[PDB]
Design goal:
2 copies of one chain form a homodimer. The first copy, chain A, is α/β, with parallel strands linked by helices. Chain A folds into 2 domains: 1-111 and 258-331, D-Maltodextrin-Binding Protein, domain 2 (3-Layer(aba) Sandwich); 112-257 and 332-388, D-Maltodextrin-Binding Protein, domain 2 (3-Layer(aba) Sandwich). Chain A is 45% helix and 19% strand. In chain A, helix 7 crosses helix 8 (186-200) and helix 15 packs antiparallel against helix 16. Chain A starts with 6 loop residues before the first strand and ends with a helix. The A-B interface holds A 72-74, 334, 338, 370-372, 374-388 and B 72-74, 334, 338, 370-372, 374-388. Chains A, B: InterPro entries: Maltose/Cyclodextrin-bd, SBP, SBP_1_CS.
Chain lengths: 388, 388
């Protein structure tokens, strides 16, 4: 049950929830109104359970990708920032927080893969994927390799597959088209081809996984890897002199890593929606509010322009943002589950020579198209009947 | 709109609808009440369209497999024959006309594959599948083959795959369990194995399709084929001296062809449900009523014991019934679409050596399990939301 005249906030235990509590303490000093921050266990399971009965927190913080599920279940209120408020944040971040074209959360922070490089082996990392084969032959003369990154998980190989036109679902006019899937187009094929022949030509090994690639980079055996901000604290400990930069281009187009956006939704059942807006818009989403959170536990790159400009003095955080701006927002729809599953197989099969590139992606597209067409029958029959 | 005090009946243009009209004329002589028989074009598309708006015929005749769809959309009334009436029909036929364990149609006639044989080449057709390899070597000395039937379509190869324990969905207590699929169990594997090695050993060709098998049998080139009653009129024209008999056993178990049951449902929106029951139970489902239909266009084997015993003087119609009693009722649920699609691939791949038997069925089971699990999310999300 859901107390009026105060805010309850849930946010994950690995965030700066003590910093967020200082923002709640400022709100109260200014306003007289109490803010309570909690970090329950298993919060993203607990939220849709408790909020369906029309209880829960007023505000929930989590990765945007799961809010598409919450919104679809009617658990998130539509938010109402004005145009001037929208303008304070990088415009691509509002595209991560829509459901049925309506805004359903405030973007807070942004995360994406970047190119991580050893500055001692490689003072200037390559601008293009095309140059990596030659760079590799040159480094292998020193007993070093050019690049090693997790090849087993589509999240890591997608940025190259997407560079030339690959995509999960087409996004147009604030909305995904679930019938327009871009896994077997000519872009995806050209990229996966370039990848598979790095392996054929012996510049990568089809078996390289997350820990193998992380050990090589942190032992100074390879000049480059591809990883996110969660990896930087291991690289600091390794004392490798590293830098973090823009991903290489492919056919002159930017690599397109998937982008995760830590967001704040408002419970559809809260009687404090205007209070939640005021707290989010005028206290948290300000340079002093993001600073308090980030000082407790770093946020990485943030959606608020004014504060990202301060953070982006760290070139590593600048690189994350540049790569995120160039990347593909992770679609927040439940059909994204079909993609992970089909594409993981396709890549692992193209990579190991089990299938050709053209064959592995063609079949991926088929499987995804089929799972969704079945999902939507489930839907048109769940619906017409659930109504009665 | 849906006139009270008379019956409107729809039945397909390839049935004995003029014979059914004579039953309607008897009802009227006895009863004073008018019966109108129609055979619209595209009736099984037209029925769920018109009956949703709560119009249509009082009674619709079609293959039972599509009534599961109609029932699920609330377009069929639950029927209420008593126990004594149920007893007039072979008990396995009432298992083809349930939805959510409730009766939703009256079984009229039954169809299934049988073993068709050339009596001149083969006066005694083999009792077991195991004996076909030796029989083949013996016939090939005469320039003849033992068996040829469509291998491209799972409907035709399923009876052997099912013999030893293969199944689509498990049926228990009047209901299918959509989570219990039996395509990769040890039964299905043993059967498909026996099939694939008939091809490896050169007794069958993986490329044989419907017309190839039909030409061979009707030219007297092969001693046996597997086909249904729709094929008998071509074999009559060929003047081959043929017989129709029980399918061979495999590991001592009966082959299990899928069974189609021509059934009669009652429109949920009809005000004449008691009239429709009376017409179906006391006029159509009697020996004089089935005779009038069958005299116009043969029904094949029928569900009514008293009349099937007259028909079963034709050994060909007896064979159809014996095979149907031994076979697997075609499941009437919409998830059966997942089966056709996955199993067709599995068989064609095991057959051509693209995959092993163990691998092709394992993957079939996976694909079917996945499509249904996606269908049912579509469903649990279509539902909970459609309600609101």
């Amino acid at each position: 049950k859901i107390e009026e005249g105060k805010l309850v906030i849930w946010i994950n235990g690995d965030k700066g929830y003590n910093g967020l509590a200082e923002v709640g303490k400022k709100f109260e000093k200014d306003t007289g109104i109490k803010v309570t921050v909690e970090h329950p266990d298993k919060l993203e399971e607990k939220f849709p359970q408790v909020a369906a009965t029309g209880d829960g927190p007023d505000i929930i913080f989590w990765a945007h990708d799961r809010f598409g599920g919450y919104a679809q279940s009617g658990l998130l209120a539509e938010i109402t920032p004005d145009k001037a408020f929208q303008d304070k944040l990088y415009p691509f971040t509002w595209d991560a927080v829509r459901y049925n074209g309506k805004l359903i959360a405030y973007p807070i922070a942004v995360e994406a893969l970047s190119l991580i490089y050893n500055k001692d082996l490689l003072p200037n990392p390559p601008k293009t994927w095309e140059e990596i084969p030659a760079l590799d032959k040159e480094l292998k003369a020193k007993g070093k390799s050019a690049l090693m990154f997790n090849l087993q998980e589509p999240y890591f190989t997608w940025p190259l597959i997407a560079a030339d036109g690959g995509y999960a679902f087409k996004y147009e006019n604030g909305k995904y088209d679930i019938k327009d899937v871009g896994v077997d187009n000519a872009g995806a094929k050209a990229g996966l081809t370039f990848l598979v022949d790095l392996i054929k030509n012996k510049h990568m090994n089809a078996d390289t996984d997350y820990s193998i690639a992380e050990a090589a980079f942190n032992k100074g055996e390879t000049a480059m890897t591809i990883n996110g901000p969660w990896a930087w604290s291991n690289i600091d400990t390794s004392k490798v002199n590293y830098g973090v930069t823009v991903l290489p281009t492919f056919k002159g187009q930017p690599s397109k890593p998937f982008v995760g956006v830590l967001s704040a939704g408002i419970n559809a059942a809260s009687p404090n929606k205007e209070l939640a807006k005021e707290f989010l818009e005028n206290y948290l989403l300000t340079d002093e509010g993001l600073e308090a959170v980030n000082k407790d536990k770093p946020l990485g790159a943030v959606a608020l322009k004014s504060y990202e400009e301060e953070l982006a003095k760290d070139p590593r955080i600048a690189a994350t943002m540049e790569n995120a701006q160039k990347g593909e927002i992770m679609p927040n729809i439940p059909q994204m589950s079909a993609f992970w599953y089909a594409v993981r197989t396709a890549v692992i099969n193209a990579a190991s020579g089990r299938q050709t590139v053209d064959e592995a992606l063609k079949d991926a597209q088929t499987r995804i198209t089929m799972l969704i067409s079945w999902y939507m029958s489930g839907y048109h029959t769940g619906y017409y009947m659930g109504f009665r």
